[PDB]
Design an enzyme around this catalytic site. Sequence first.
Site, PDB file in Angstrom:
ATOM      1  CG  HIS A 138       7.307  -4.543   1.728  1.00  0.00           C
ATOM      2  ND1 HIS A 138       7.953  -3.401   2.137  1.00  0.00           N
ATOM      3  CD2 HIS A 138       6.244  -4.145   0.993  1.00  0.00           C
ATOM      4  CE1 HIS A 138       7.308  -2.348   1.662  1.00  0.00           C
ATOM      5  NE2 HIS A 138       6.263  -2.774   0.972  1.00  0.00           N
ATOM      6  CG  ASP A 171      -0.317   0.208   2.551  1.00  0.00           C
ATOM      7  OD1 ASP A 171       0.826  -0.247   2.823  1.00  0.00           O
ATOM      8  OD2 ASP A 171      -0.966   0.918   3.377  1.00  0.00           O
ATOM      9  CG  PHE A 213       8.256   0.626  -3.387  1.00  0.00           C
ATOM     10  CD1 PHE A 213       7.678  -0.351  -4.171  1.00  0.00           C
ATOM     11  CD2 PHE A 213       8.319   0.441  -2.027  1.00  0.00           C
ATOM     12  CE1 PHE A 213       7.223  -1.523  -3.599  1.00  0.00           C
ATOM     13  CE2 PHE A 213       7.878  -0.714  -1.452  1.00  0.00           C
ATOM     14  CZ  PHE A 213       7.323  -1.702  -2.235  1.00  0.00           C
ATOM     15  CE1 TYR A 226       7.843   4.416   0.953  1.00  0.00           C
ATOM     16  CE2 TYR A 226       7.468   5.572  -1.113  1.00  0.00           C
ATOM     17  CZ  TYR A 226       8.221   4.712  -0.362  1.00  0.00           C
ATOM     18  OH  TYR A 226       9.377   4.173  -0.923  1.00  0.00           O
TER      19      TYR A 226
HETATM   20 NA    NA Z   1       3.754   4.566  -2.413  1.00  0.00          NA
END
Ligand code: NA
Length: 223
Positions: free
Chosen positions: A187, A64, A77, A66
């Site tokens: 992750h 999901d 990311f 930030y």
């Molecule tokens: Na993101």
Amino acid sequence: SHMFGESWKKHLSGEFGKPYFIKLMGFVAEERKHYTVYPPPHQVFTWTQMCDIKDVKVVILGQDPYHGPNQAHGLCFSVQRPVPPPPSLENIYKELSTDIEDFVHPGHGDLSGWAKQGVLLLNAVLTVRAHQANSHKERGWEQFTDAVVSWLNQNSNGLVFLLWGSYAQKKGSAIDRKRHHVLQTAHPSPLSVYRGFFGCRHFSKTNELLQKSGKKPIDWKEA
DNA sequence: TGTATCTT
DNA sequence: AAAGATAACA
Ligand code: NA
Ligand code: NA
Ligand code: NA
């Protein structure tokens, strides 16, 4: 409003008339009216705005967005200048520099240059309440991003899917493993990177697979 | 304190 | 479902 890329809208707009999606967007709107939700509304679907859907070659799936101010902007990311790379992205860069000998830290966190080459930078869940990781899970996003994966699974050939983390890996059952390549690892968050992400060599393996399929490889340094 | 995955 | 444990590294 030009928030959904045209080629994506063409193949995914059927979802907009389904109750789960209607109710999902109502939930997000009610969250925004009482809390801070990330990314901002015009950036939930940035991942549709970077390349034509038929030009996708690689799918990176995370969990999901930030959950801190000015970080998420709709590409998993990634962060827009001048925000510094969050820890997860620093770990990605750190794996890139051991995996790809030419890769050096680019000095920013904007991954738009990968997306422009046909790397779909998707999360399984596309919104989050500020400060609370995965707070919008199980509300309907997973069915929508399932439809994204299912369309690519059925209409493309030889894609590389990188499933990073347990929640992204839930999409693996929907992908024909004999027609696409699925690489899975932990992750890149500091809270999990030690469970396999360092050493996974997904970026070189991706280019190997593209090469062998007769496709141009990703220039990971361009971005 | 800050950034997943497992067990109960 | 969710609190707490486990985990590692600033
Ligand atoms: Na993101
Ligand atoms: Na429905
Ligand atoms: Na908001």
